[PDB]
Amino acid sequence: QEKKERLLREATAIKEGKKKEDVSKKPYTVKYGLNHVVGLIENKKASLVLIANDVDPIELVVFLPALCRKMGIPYAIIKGKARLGTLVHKKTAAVVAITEVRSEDKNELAKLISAVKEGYLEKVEDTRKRWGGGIMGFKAQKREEKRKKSLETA
Amino acid sequence: PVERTGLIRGLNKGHKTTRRVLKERPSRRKGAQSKRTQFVRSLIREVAGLAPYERRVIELLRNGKDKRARKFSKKKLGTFGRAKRKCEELQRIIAESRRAH
């Protein structure tokens, strides 16, 4: 509905004889779409990247933290592709990005970027290089505890 | 281009015609290494790592057995030239690791 209203205003402006830039202002929106976000990261236009944690297949985003680290972009892994879809008016979104915001929110964006850096990336600097999984089952852990207790007693 | 002799036999044989220099056909650009392709392949290499046979070749090259590494690479890949190129690439990888360390 907002796009139809903007197009009606621009059509009125063209009919009366001014350019559409005279009636429309420069937009500031969340950037989304996986190919678009990867292109923005490669062109170093993205200021902040949020990557969904449950993308299936995982190959679509498995290179993204390494790409952001090489390009110097701050990234954060966030729970919910549906949660990003609620931002981008979709059912799901694999990744979202901010390139630029308005002047009343640039301070908030800088504070968020610094907070994401200090409270996420410094904490996951060491744990991102570790192997996951390897957890044993309940009965297997109980059997292992029982045999270690038996070996310690004997 | 070398001008032909005008004879039916011998070196540079054939009918004498003035030759033209041709611009490179864009179909002949295949194999040229592009900048984005460099960046993407480097990122994928450092994300994915090495194959087990690549690890074996790297261990042989660090131990200094070069002919054995070439023979192992030929047995794995299939051809001598592919083995030579793979051994050169793993030598380059060893060189970057050594210059970092």
């Binding site: 490669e42 062109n43 170093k44 | 984005r36 960046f39």
Partner: peptide, 9 residues
């Protein structure tokens, strides 16, 4: 930066 192509403007 990495670019697929030269972009307009």
């Amino acid at each position: 930066a990495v670019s697929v192509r030269k972009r307009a403007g």
